Amino acid sequence: SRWSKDYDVCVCHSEEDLVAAQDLVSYLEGSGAISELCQALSSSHCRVLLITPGFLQDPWCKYQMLQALTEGCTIPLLSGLSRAAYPPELRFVDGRGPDGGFRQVKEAVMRYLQTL
Template structure:
């Protein structure tokens, strides 16, 4: 673990120079840019965005997507490319990338746990290096702890066989970036948008049900109300 911290500090110090020296990949839909966009760093309200992105429910959390990856150079570059794609217009998603967004000198574990709580979804870039790093497995378990049965986790696999896929998330659908990376990036964006759209839809349904209950018949002295209460009694079970 101490070696991991040394590698992290070294990687963050050389981040700018690595970005200048390494050529961008040709299979990414948008140019690589590691500069945080306004959509990533801003916590203010929405501005001229699609309905799912402009909803108040979305802006209750700081990030739309948190991206977890290993310290391997290839994984770092892949995560940067993905975040650049998602943050670029017209997608305008707000992403958390710990190598960029963790404050220097702050406790990394604490900041990561807070970022998990402040993000709608978490993406795991699962590669051979990811499976070898204890820190990555910690990140995966932390994300699972926040929502073990929810739809908030997006596994992304690259260059691993099916038998290496972590058992902890075997019931989650994954996106295979090894087949078509452009299509994979677009699918990630669509998944985030679908999640936000479902949030808005569920909120509207809930509000509609609340309004209907307020506008319904009074329970006091109503035989219909008595029938509903009796019908909602828990069913008896036999062992």
């Protein structure tokens, strides 16, 4: 049912996290292959929450987190933020994993294609 939507993935980042959001994109797309920068109104099956310091500080994007958990696929890549400050809503992917955490998000990215 994938064709009902246009993109496999969507990496959401705040300001300045861009060069690094481009690095995940290429990772997904570079290896029914897998990527887009979010970037808005992006019919995308999955979404990537690149949780970082400026992002924590940039709360607009922060409202965005809710919409995602609001009303499905979404993968929070928290990179560079202590395992302290990192909302708890989550207590319920790590930036310490393989490739800095890029394998899981795509690693965990796949199962969904079987879902589609």
